[PDB]
Amino acid sequence: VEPVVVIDGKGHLVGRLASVVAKQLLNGQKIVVVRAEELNISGEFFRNKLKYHDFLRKATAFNKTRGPFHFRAPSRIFYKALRGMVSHKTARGKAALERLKVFEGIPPPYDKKKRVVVPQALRVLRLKPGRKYTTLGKLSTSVGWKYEDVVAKLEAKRKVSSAEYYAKKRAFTKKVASANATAAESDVAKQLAALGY
Amino acid sequence: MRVRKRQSRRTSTKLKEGIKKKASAHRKKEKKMAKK
Amino acid sequence: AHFKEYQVIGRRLPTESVPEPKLFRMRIFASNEVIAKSRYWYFLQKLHKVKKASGEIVSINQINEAHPTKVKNFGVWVRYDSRSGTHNMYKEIRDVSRVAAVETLYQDMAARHRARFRSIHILKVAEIEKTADVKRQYVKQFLTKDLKFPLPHRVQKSTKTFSYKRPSTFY
Amino acid sequence: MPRSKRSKLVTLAQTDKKGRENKERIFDEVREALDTYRYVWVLHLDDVRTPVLQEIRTSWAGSKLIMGKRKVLQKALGEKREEEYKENLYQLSKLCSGVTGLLFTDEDVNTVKEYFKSYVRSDYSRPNTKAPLTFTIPEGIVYSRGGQIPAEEDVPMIHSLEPTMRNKFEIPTKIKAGKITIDSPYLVCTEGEKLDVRQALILKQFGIAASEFKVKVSAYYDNDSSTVESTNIN
Amino acid sequence: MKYIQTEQQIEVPEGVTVSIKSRIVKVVGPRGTLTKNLKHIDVTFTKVNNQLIKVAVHNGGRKHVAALRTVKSLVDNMITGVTKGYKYKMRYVYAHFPINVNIVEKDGAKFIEVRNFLGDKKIRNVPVRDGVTIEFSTNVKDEIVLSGNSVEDVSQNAADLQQICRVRNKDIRKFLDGIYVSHKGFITEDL
Amino acid sequence: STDSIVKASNWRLVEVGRVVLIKKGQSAGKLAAIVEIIDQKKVLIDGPKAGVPRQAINLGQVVLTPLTFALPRGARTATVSKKWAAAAVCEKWAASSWAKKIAQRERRAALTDFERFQVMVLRKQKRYTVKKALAKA
RNA sequence: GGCCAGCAUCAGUUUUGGUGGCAGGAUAAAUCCAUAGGAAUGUAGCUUGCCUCGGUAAGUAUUAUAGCCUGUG
RNA sequence: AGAACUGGCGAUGCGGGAUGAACCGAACGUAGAGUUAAGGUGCCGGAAUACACGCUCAUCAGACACCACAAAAGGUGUUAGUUCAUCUAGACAGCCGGACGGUGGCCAUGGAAGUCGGAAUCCGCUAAGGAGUGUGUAACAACUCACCGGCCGAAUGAACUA
RNA sequence: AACUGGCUUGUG
RNA sequence: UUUGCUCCACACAAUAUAGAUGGAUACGAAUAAGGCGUCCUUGUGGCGUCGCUGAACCAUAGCAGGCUAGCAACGGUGCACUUGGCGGAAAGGCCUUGGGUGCUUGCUGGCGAAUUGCAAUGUCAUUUUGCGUGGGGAUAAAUCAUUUGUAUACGACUUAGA
């Protein structure tokens, strides 16, 4: 629908997001993902950390270099699980994953562009309350992604910038709504409502 | 920590068919006993 | 499947010098006729010395309910042979009809006991007119005056994969 | 709450529980008492001693003094006018509010109403009460009496009880050799204040029955008159 | 058994005021204020009027409702900690070696400094949390008093403090010395 | 000023009296009212006026409206119709902004291409007016 | 007069929708109309308390200033 | 282990079982269209992130073919049951009081007072209070239950199964 | 030249 | 440079497109909560209102978009300039000033289209490159050989050399 989709990854879950993404890629929508320090995974911190140390101890015992890379960072985690969801060895796969771009935080140029969500992956719908979740920023900094305090600063910069922006947009909508409702009660408006607008 | 080795949950077929043959032995023994 | 309640009688065959035996009746729950019949013969072979070949069926009649939409408290005495020796049980439902109550029962027994339709027995349905002789509590709390409660955390089931809105439940 | 419950402590003690058999037993027994005896006295006794009650009973065997649970005593007396063993009993079933306690006599009224004014004992504070004395504990060795008697003949308090003094009684109690000592004097209470439970306990620990004990009564009934009498004497 | 609605009452007195947006609380009274986040707990609050507030849960599992009773008692502890204020009293006892105990301020740090412990040379500092004040006991030997509004801060600080003198490798029955709590009262005295 | 300012936590509540919309089933865009509650997730309803039967239903198939009127449990359909027309909900609902939106989507789906070109031009005219209205003031 | 295709009508095969007329069951059961009786998670009304002076509390009250349940038709 | 019968494989491919001698389905000429079996439907992967009742939240669950081997049980995790007990004539939790006299019962001992310890199991008043659970001092004392009773008023508890 | 069939482990 | 490199204009050529064919239309935090507006004592304030799908908002007629006439308005939009700001996370864009230049379907007129023959993607977008056309721009380093030796298996590495 949109040529370039820009997901916000906050409030979301990995697997469910990953599945919907992978299918959208294999059908071709160029998809981009942000804020993936603030993803969520089910379960508790310690279960997820035990898991990841297990993946971390997996290594090629004859030469440790050439085997399973324990990518620490969040975006590349998400990429990992997605690479499991895809046939990454073949060309349909590779020309899927060249339709994917993962970032942390939000760089430009997408902050000036629209962000979306997924319904059917979100924590806040999908999880029963009284049940734990795990911020990937906390997790990955616990396991050796040494950039977390940076991105919070930059996102804090972005947030005020967007704040001033929304103030402008709001005032503009205020004026425009007043203008349109004052222009309403014209017969053309009556006819529009007659036709359902 | 040092997160230690797991047992799998993988199928490992010899144990499946060993289970089936063991099961039939168990049920045979049950029928040999069940007259009493 | 989706269930019905049936009325059956069997009239075990006329033998000479005992014609017309005593028309043993049952009320039997199932989704259709022949399943109902087979269960009549199954209970009957348990309860006294019959076989199907030595017996014959009088009639099948769907029992509709008299006043369906009357909310009713039902209480059901049942048996089941789980893996152990057989054993009894009572359960209590606030519901609309006998048939729907036993529907919910069959599924709940399936959850909580891994209990099959085949190895369930119903003894009996009863309906309770007056309150406050229901033994259980989880129905009993649904009987109080001026009752109100919420649907918290309501979630809306969209067809689309995207939403552009940062949704919410309400509240 | 099928699991994650408390475990209640199981023992092998000798005494067993009474149940309703003793309840209905005493009910019918007072109803037996009613027509037999003639003079009836309702007794509010909040602080009670087992030897005092036995002393009163072995004083008056021709009387009978009965105590038991309240609502069944109200039952056996009859709480309504509609239900009662005899008449004019519901109204005096109303008033009997406190720890009661009851007597069945056939003797004079005068002798008993002067008896229980003459009858006075020494008991403890039993708080939500006054105790007619104050106590400062001196900044020295502490003793079983707490400064009552001379310091030569009082015995110092045992070194077992001191952590109870630190925990319950809120008091700094510091332990030199085997006796027990304090560093500042401790006043426990004053006159004219309602004694607290820790205050009552410390005077108990000293073992001081500084409070007077006298029973009051509120009322009297006679069967042959079949009439109720109201008397607040203490 | 999946209780449908559970609920408890908390009693606001006349003096004190409370402001509850979503699951945040502020509680203000004469001694001062406190705040607390409770976003992890998933309940509902309601006023009826101004001396009583109702907490509640709908569709409770056992864990959910046990949490309900807990959160009530937490907020009541805050209320007490404003209107009364809480007050915890300790003593620091020695057989041979007198403690030197002191208060210091390192850049505004409010450390608590102990020396001569068991004939040591070691300095041990303990921080003080915000919102709690110290006093060494005037006219009472070998005693220290803490007072505050945050009960959790107070108890955590003193529990730390007796957790510092956990004397190690040595027979506890002999080394009776240490720093311990005398009692847990309120500030007031009268009420 | 020295009073406690928690806010009411406005719920929509299920109770005897709650009037309800249906999103899936046969009626599937019609109203009714509860009479009775069965459990947390099933309720027994009936609305005669729109046409819908009496029935049990599961709650996830329905959504609540803020609207309510007083009503007694165990009701019969004559009783609820009488109370309904006394309480005047159909006007209230249809005046509510939600039903305006439902009607809007309905009509737009019911709409002809010729009328689509009409709305195009009339929207352009309104736009002309309004964009003059702005950039001046 | 070769190559690729398209439209219509027809046939075999087949998938998917609309719609009408019929039969059956307890000649559906129910709703709905009337009627009789009953009772409460007790509606009006009555009594007492508070009083924020109308909402509780406990009694009363079987339709009344709501209604429900059952039986028959 | 031995016999007897029967079916599969052997000469035989195909779909599924992640892969496969033994499993599940299935009558092989080439092609088209349709419908299905066994198995499955989050993504790999064609198919419902379908509907719906319940239970589960594991500090390496389970997704198992199942009775089957560790195995009978432990577990203050959790839901539902069974059988018994209690009760506004006041259940359970609790807070308060009593919780006695003969009696410090007999030897036993330096000391043994309900509790270092052997054996006895009384009556008295009793609402109830044992020849006496547990802390205890050298003994004694003091405190606690088990037992009743006062305030509260509401349902609760033992055992067992699943 | 190294688990028939989860083999082996602390308790006659 | 037999004018070689480069910035920019238009003519043609190839050259392909993991696949445009109205718009990637901007807050954040929470969801047992919030947003939007308004008022006040400006706060976790009050008051009203909204969601319950983007099934929307914007844009949108003219030969794949012409030639023309006006009417109403001085508003909108495009092009190339030009003033002044803002943004570093991969900024590579977003504002904004001025006028010039068109068009304006806000409304009413007039002309044309045909014949692609009942439809055939009926081609209109972007990446890359070269030849030419004509206005600008600027005038290198590396390597081999030699030599060194802090390095050196030969390569490599590190030094000096008009």
Q: Which domain holds residue F60?
A: 13-95
Asked if D172 and E139 come within 8 Å (Cβ–Cβ), the reply is no
**Cβ–Cβ below 8 Å for A125 and C166:** no
Q: Is the CB of residue E182 less than 8 Å from the CB of residue E143?
A: yes
Nearest to E44 among F2, F4, F9 (CB): F9
Chain C residue with the nearest C-alpha to that of F70: C146
Q: Three-state SS for A38?
A: coil
Q: Tell me: cis bond preceding E30? Omega within 30 of 0 counts.
A: no
CB contact residues (below 8 A), chain E span 71-110, against chain F? none
Discontinuities in chain B with C to N beyond 2.5 Å fall right after none
As assigned by CATH, the class of the C69-145 domain is: alpha beta
| Token pair recorded at residue E24 | 């945040």
Q: Degrees (nearest 5) of the Cα angle D154, D158, D164?
A: 125
Position of tokens 């820790």? D198
User: Separation of CA F63 and C1' G4 in angstroms?
Assistant: 58
Q: Residues D198, D168: contact at Cβ < 8 Å?
A: yes
Beta carbons of A53 and B3 less than 8 Å apart: yes
CB contact under 8 A, C137 and E1: yes
Contacts of C39 (CB under 8 A, 6+ apart): C28, C30
Instruction: Report whether C16 contacts C30 (CB < 8 A).
Output: no
Find and list the nucleotides of strand H having atoms within 7 Å of a protein beta carbon. Answer: 18-20, 22, 42-45, 49-55, 57-60, 62-69, 76-83, 86-90, 93, 95-101, 124-130, 132-133, 136-137, 140-143, 145-151, 156-158, 161-162
Q: Does C170 sit within 8 Å of F13, measured CB to CB? A: no
- Decide the pairing of beta strands E178-186 and E124-126: unpaired
Write out the residues of chain C at the interface with chain F, using a CB-CB cutoff of 8 A.
69-71, 94-96, 100, 142, 147-152, 154, 170-171
Q: Is the CB of D16 under 7 A from strand H?
A: yes
Work out the minimum CA distance from A187 to partner chain E, whole angstroms.
45
Q: Is the dihedral of CA D58, D59, D65, D68 positive or negative?
A: negative
Helix, strand and coil in chain E, % to nearest 5: 20, 40, 40
Q: Find the nucleotide nearest C131 (Cα to C1′).
A: G41
Q: Which residue has the tokens 């109702």?
A: E54
Computed over its alpha carbons, how large is the radius of gyration of chain C?
Answer: 22
Chain F residues near residue A192 by CB distance under 8 angstroms: 119, 122-123, 126
Residue B29, CB, less than 7 Å from strand I?
no
Check CB contact of D1 with chain E, cutoff 8 Å. yes
Residue contact E183–D1, C-beta within 8 A: no
Distance CA A145, CA C57 (A): 77
Residue F115, chain A, CB below 8 Å: the answer is yes
- Taking the C-alpha atoms of residue F131 and residue F124, their distance in angstroms, rounded to an integer, is 10
Which of E55, E85, E115 terminates a domain? The answer is: E85
Residues of chain A contacting C162 with CB distance shorter than 8 Å: 1, 5, 116-119
> Could you give the 3-state DSSP secondary structure of residue F127?
helix
CA of residue B12 to C1' of nucleotide H62, angstroms: 17
- Name D186's bridge partners: D137
Give residues with Cβ within 8 angstroms of A32, minimum separation 6: A4, A5, A6, A7, A100, A101, A102, A103, A110
* Structure determined via: cryo-EM
**Calpha distance D209→A27 (Å, rounded):** 94
Nearest chain A alpha carbon to C155: A125
Q: From A131, which residue of chain E is nearest by alpha-carbon distance?
A: E40
What would the two tokens of residue C3 be? 């269930």
Contact, B25 CB vs strand I, < 7 Å: yes
Which residue in the block uniquely carries the two structure tokens 């369930």? Answer: C120
In the structure, how far is the CA atom of residue A128 from the C1' atom of nucleotide J85, in angstroms? 50
Rounded distance between C-alpha atoms, residue C77 and residue C91, angstroms:
7
**What three-state secondary structure class fits B11?**
coil
Query: Are E52 and E90 found together in one domain?
Result: no
Domains A1-147 and A148-197 share a fold: no
CA distance C121 to chain E (A): 25
Helix (H) or strand (E) holding E148: strand E143-148
DSSP A69-122: ----SHHHHHHHHHHHHTTTTSHHHHHHHTTEEE-SS--TTTTTS--BB-STTB
Whether E136 and E49 share a structural domain: no
Chain E nearest-CA distance from C4, in A, is 30
Whether the Cβ atoms of residue F111 and residue A174 lie closer than 8 Å to each other: no
C2-68 against C69-145: fold identical: yes
DSSP letter string, chain C: ---EEEEEEE--PPBTTB-S---EEEEEEESSHHHHHHHHHHHHHHHSS--STT--EEEEEE---SSTTS-EEEEEEEEE--SSS-EEEEEEEEES-HHHHHHHHHHHHHHHH---TTTEEEEEEEEE-SSS----STTGGGG-TT-EEE--S-----SSS-BSS------
The structural domains of chain C, with segments of one domain joined by +, span: 2-68, 69-145
* Contact assessment for residue C32 and residue C81, using Cβ atoms and an 8 Å cutoff: no
Q: What is the DSSP letter of E117?
A: G
* CATH T-level topology, domain A148-197: 1.20.5
**H helices present in D42-192, as ranges:** 50-59, 70-77, 90-95, 109-118, 162-167
CA distance C92 to A151: 57
Q: Residue D44: phi, psi to the nearest 5? A: -85, 115
Residues 6+ apart with CB under 8 A from A9: A17, A33, A34, A35, A36, A38, A39, A78
Task: Give yes or no for C171 touching A (CB within 8 A).
Answer: no
Q: Look at chain E and report how many structural domains it folds into.
A: 2
In three-state secondary structure terms, B12 is coil
Residue whose tokens read 């999946």: E2
**Which one, of A138, A147, A164, lies nearest residue A44 by Cα?**
A138
Radius of gyration of chain F (CA): 21
Q: A60 in helix, strand or coil?
A: coil
Q: Are D211 and D128 in contact (CB under 8 A)?
A: no
Q: Specify the CATH class of C2-68 in words.
A: alpha beta
B33 part of contact set with chain A, CB < 8 Å: no
Let me know whether E190 and E170 are in one domain: yes
Computed on alpha carbons and rounded to an integer, the radius of gyration of chain D in Å comes to: 24
End-to-end CA distance of chain A: 24
E36 with E90, same domain?
Answer: no
Enter the resolution in angstroms.
3.9
Secondary structure class of B1 (helix, strand, coil): coil
Contacts of A192 (CB under 8 A, 6+ apart): F119, F122, F123, F126
User: What is the enclosing helix (H) or strand (E) of A56?
Assistant: helix A45-57
| D and E touching (3 or more beta-carbon pairs closer than 8 Å) | yes
Q: Please indicate whether chains E and B are in contact, defined as at least 3 beta carbon pairs under 8 Å.
A: no
Q: Which of F2, F3, F6 sits opposite E45 (nearest CB)?
A: F6
**Structural domain boundaries enclosing E50:** 1-85
Cα separation, C144 vs A20, whole angstroms: 46
Name the closest nucleotide to B21, judged by C1' and CA: I5
Q: Give the best residue of C148, C156, C159, C168 to mutate against chain F (max F CB count within 10 A).
A: C148
State which fold the A1-147 domain adopts: Ribosomal Protein L13p; Chain: A; (3.90.1180)
* Bridge partners, residue C28, by sequence: C6
Q: Residue E158's domain is classified under what CATH number?
A: 3.90.930.12
| Residues F117, A15: Cα–Cα separation, whole Å | 45
B23 CB less than 7 Å from any atom of strand I: no
